[PDB]
Design an enzyme around this catalytic site. Structure first.
Site, mmCIF file in Angstrom:
data_model
loop_
_atom_site.group_PDB
_atom_site.id
_atom_site.type_symbol
_atom_site.label_atom_id
_atom_site.label_comp_id
_atom_site.label_asym_id
_atom_site.label_seq_id
_atom_site.Cartn_x
_atom_site.Cartn_y
_atom_site.Cartn_z
ATOM 1 N N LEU A 50 0.933 -1.184 0.092
ATOM 2 C CA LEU A 50 0.155 0.120 0.041
ATOM 3 C C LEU A 50 1.025 1.250 0.094
ATOM 4 C CD1 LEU A 50 -3.066 -0.903 2.372
ATOM 5 C CD2 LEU A 50 -2.421 -1.692 -0.099
ATOM 6 N N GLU A 107 -8.193 0.368 9.307
ATOM 7 C CA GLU A 107 -8.815 0.115 8.078
ATOM 8 C C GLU A 107 -8.784 -1.469 7.549
ATOM 9 O OE1 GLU A 107 -10.007 0.523 4.277
ATOM 10 O OE2 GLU A 107 -8.238 -0.210 4.489
HETATM 11 N N1 LIG Z 1 -5.378 -0.201 -1.687
HETATM 12 C C1 LIG Z 1 -5.962 -1.187 -2.063
HETATM 13 O O1 LIG Z 1 -7.338 -1.292 -1.831
HETATM 14 C C2 LIG Z 1 -5.418 -2.231 -2.582
HETATM 15 C C3 LIG Z 1 -4.148 -2.273 -3.186
HETATM 16 N N2 LIG Z 1 -3.608 -3.204 -3.636
HETATM 17 C C4 LIG Z 1 -1.991 -2.732 -4.107
HETATM 18 O O2 LIG Z 1 -1.927 -2.887 -5.449
HETATM 19 C C5 LIG Z 1 -0.770 -3.447 -6.234
HETATM 20 C C6 LIG Z 1 -1.432 -4.610 -7.002
HETATM 21 O O3 LIG Z 1 -1.976 -4.491 -7.751
HETATM 22 P P1 LIG Z 1 -2.016 -4.520 -9.578
HETATM 23 O O4 LIG Z 1 -0.564 -4.186 -10.025
HETATM 24 O O5 LIG Z 1 -3.134 -3.835 -10.062
HETATM 25 O O6 LIG Z 1 -2.156 -5.952 -9.720
HETATM 26 P P2 LIG Z 1 -3.269 -7.300 -9.736
HETATM 27 O O7 LIG Z 1 -3.441 -7.739 -8.587
HETATM 28 O O8 LIG Z 1 -4.430 -6.901 -10.651
HETATM 29 O O9 LIG Z 1 -2.127 -8.557 -10.571
HETATM 30 C C7 LIG Z 1 -2.192 -8.368 -11.901
HETATM 31 C C8 LIG Z 1 -2.010 -9.670 -12.338
HETATM 32 O O10 LIG Z 1 -3.225 -10.380 -12.215
HETATM 33 C C9 LIG Z 1 -3.394 -11.083 -13.377
HETATM 34 N N3 LIG Z 1 -4.908 -10.349 -13.701
HETATM 35 C C10 LIG Z 1 -5.380 -9.281 -13.607
HETATM 36 N N4 LIG Z 1 -6.607 -9.162 -13.901
HETATM 37 C C11 LIG Z 1 -6.686 -10.338 -14.655
HETATM 38 C C12 LIG Z 1 -7.868 -10.611 -15.279
HETATM 39 N N5 LIG Z 1 -8.922 -9.814 -15.563
HETATM 40 N N6 LIG Z 1 -7.626 -11.911 -15.989
HETATM 41 C C13 LIG Z 1 -6.791 -12.587 -15.961
HETATM 42 N N7 LIG Z 1 -5.817 -12.363 -15.005
HETATM 43 C C14 LIG Z 1 -5.682 -11.048 -14.598
HETATM 44 C C15 LIG Z 1 -2.357 -10.882 -14.406
HETATM 45 O O11 LIG Z 1 -1.709 -12.013 -14.056
HETATM 46 P P3 LIG Z 1 -0.764 -12.871 -15.420
HETATM 47 O O12 LIG Z 1 0.238 -11.759 -15.814
HETATM 48 O O13 LIG Z 1 -0.401 -14.222 -14.558
HETATM 49 O O14 LIG Z 1 -1.863 -13.173 -16.092
HETATM 50 C C16 LIG Z 1 -1.827 -9.661 -13.998
HETATM 51 O O15 LIG Z 1 -0.391 -9.681 -14.392
HETATM 52 C C17 LIG Z 1 -0.200 -3.878 -4.970
HETATM 53 O O16 LIG Z 1 0.793 -2.640 -4.667
HETATM 54 C C18 LIG Z 1 -1.005 -3.912 -3.937
HETATM 55 O O17 LIG Z 1 -0.342 -3.740 -2.684
HETATM 56 C C19 LIG Z 1 -4.185 -4.271 -4.207
HETATM 57 C C20 LIG Z 1 -5.270 -4.384 -3.722
HETATM 58 C C21 LIG Z 1 -6.310 -3.402 -3.090
HETATM 59 C C1 LIG Z 2 -4.073 -5.375 -0.330
HETATM 60 N N1 LIG Z 2 -5.006 -5.900 0.347
HETATM 61 C C2 LIG Z 2 -4.301 -6.646 1.761
HETATM 62 C C3 LIG Z 2 -3.212 -6.674 2.055
HETATM 63 C C4 LIG Z 2 -2.657 -7.365 3.094
HETATM 64 C C5 LIG Z 2 -3.440 -8.015 4.099
HETATM 65 O O1 LIG Z 2 -2.884 -8.786 5.064
HETATM 66 C C6 LIG Z 2 -3.436 -8.692 6.175
HETATM 67 F F1 LIG Z 2 -4.607 -9.237 5.840
HETATM 68 F F2 LIG Z 2 -3.330 -7.605 6.942
HETATM 69 F F3 LIG Z 2 -2.639 -9.648 7.119
HETATM 70 C C7 LIG Z 2 -4.672 -8.162 3.463
HETATM 71 C C8 LIG Z 2 -5.372 -7.502 2.710
HETATM 72 C C9 LIG Z 2 -5.779 -5.064 1.024
HETATM 73 C C10 LIG Z 2 -5.756 -4.343 2.171
HETATM 74 C C11 LIG Z 2 -6.519 -3.269 2.626
HETATM 75 C C12 LIG Z 2 -7.687 -2.952 1.721
HETATM 76 N N2 LIG Z 2 -8.471 -2.190 2.297
HETATM 77 C C13 LIG Z 2 -9.550 -1.887 1.563
HETATM 78 N N3 LIG Z 2 -10.379 -1.155 1.883
HETATM 79 N N4 LIG Z 2 -10.032 -2.483 0.419
HETATM 80 C C14 LIG Z 2 -8.807 -3.476 -0.268
HETATM 81 N N5 LIG Z 2 -9.203 -4.100 -1.151
HETATM 82 C C15 LIG Z 2 -7.808 -3.657 0.642
HETATM 83 N N6 LIG Z 2 -6.943 -4.725 0.168
#
Ligand SMILES: NC(=O)C1=CN([C@@H]2O[C@H](COP(=O)(O)OP(=O)(O)OC[C@H]3O[C@@H](n4cnc5c(N)ncnc54)[C@H](OP(=O)(O)O)[C@@H]3O)[C@@H](O)[C@H]2O)C=CC1
Ligand SMILES: CN(c1ccc(OC(F)(F)F)cc1)c1ccc2nc(N)nc(N)c2n1
Length: 186
Positions: A22, A30
């Site tokens: 993050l 959160e």
């Molecule tokens: N703030 C938040 O709420 C959240 C934050 N994060 C952060 O975001 C970052 C990760 O995000 P991001 O880089 O977008 O990566 P993703 O988690 O979307 O991973 C991307 C990979 O997932 C696969 N992929 C994604 N979409 C599809 C699809 N529609 N169909 C088939 N395969 C798919 C592909 O894998 P392949 O190349 O193997 O085909 C792609 O290379 C991290 O820094 C994480 O910490 C993640 C979730 C929530």
């Molecule tokens: C990337 N991810 C996540 C990362 C690490 C985690 O390890 C743990 F569970 F803390 F041990 C669990 C969840 C998160 C973390 C916070 C997030 N907040 C909201 N509101 N929405 C999301 N989709 C999100 N997703």
């Protein structure tokens, strides 16, 4: 299936990730909100399904994978089997959503939660039908390399309230943030 939902935490500049984590320091309440919303299922005997991309799965620390009490599905076209600890693998979002209609899931899944990253959110957000977005607004700019897709406010309406969602501004580690819910039906 009991419905389709996205959940994200996003900075003011639409950031969600930076270098595999993050963009901001850990906000414990959160994370507690994320775990509660994604895990809680109202339908007796069912569980919720979390759908995430491959990089999101590997961003969770290994001791916390799979996300407990949820069915964990990873999207990848490269992987040949779910990553270690994960439950399912799909090559597309439509495939994953079809999978929920199959006998092994049709009677188990209550809510489907898209938990990131960007490409998964963008597709789900443009998917027809009733969809909710649970957005935590982190109310500062943070340097990021992964961003949340645009929310089209012509279709998504910001709700004034939602059960179980605290409405007021929150603060941890000197960072103010607020829980929002958006809903579309198209
Ligand atoms: N703030 C938040 O709420 C959240 C934050 N994060 C952060 O975001 C970052 C990760 O995000 P991001 O880089 O977008 O990566 P993703 O988690 O979307 O991973 C991307 C990979 O997932 C696969 N992929 C994604 N979409 C599809 C699809 N529609 N169909 C088939 N395969 C798919 C592909 O894998 P392949 O190349 O193997 O085909 C792609 O290379 C991290 O820094 C994480 O910490 C993640 C979730 C929530
Ligand atoms: C990337 N991810 C996540 C990362 C690490 C985690 O390890 C743990 F569970 F803390 F041990 C669990 C969840 C998160 C973390 C916070 C997030 N907040 C909201 N509101 N929405 C999301 N989709 C999100 N997703």
């Amino acid at each position: 299936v009991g419905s389709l939902n996205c959940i994200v935490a996003v900075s003011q500049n639409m950031g969600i990730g930076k270098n595999g984590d993050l963009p901001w320091p850990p906000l414990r309440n959160e994370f507690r909100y994320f775990q509660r919303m994604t895990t809680t299922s109202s339908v007796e005997g069912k569980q919720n399904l979390v759908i995430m991309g491959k990089k999101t799965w590997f961003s969770i620390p290994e001791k916390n994978r799979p996300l407990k009490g949820r069915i964990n599905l990873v999207l990848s076209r490269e992987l040949k089997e779910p990553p270690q600890g994960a439950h399912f693998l799909s090559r597309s979002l439509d495939d994953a959503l079809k999978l929920t209609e199959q006998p092994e899931l049709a009677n188990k899944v209550d809510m489907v939660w898209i938990v990131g990253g960007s490409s998964v959110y963008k597709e789900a957000m443009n998917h027809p039908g009733h969809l909710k977005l649970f957005v935590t607004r982190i109310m500062q700019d943070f340097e990021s390399d992964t961003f949340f897709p645009e929310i089209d406010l012509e279709k998504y309406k910001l709700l004034p309230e939602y059960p179980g969602v605290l409405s007021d501004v929150q603060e941890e580690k000197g960072i103010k943030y607020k829980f929002e819910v958006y809903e579309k039906n198209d």
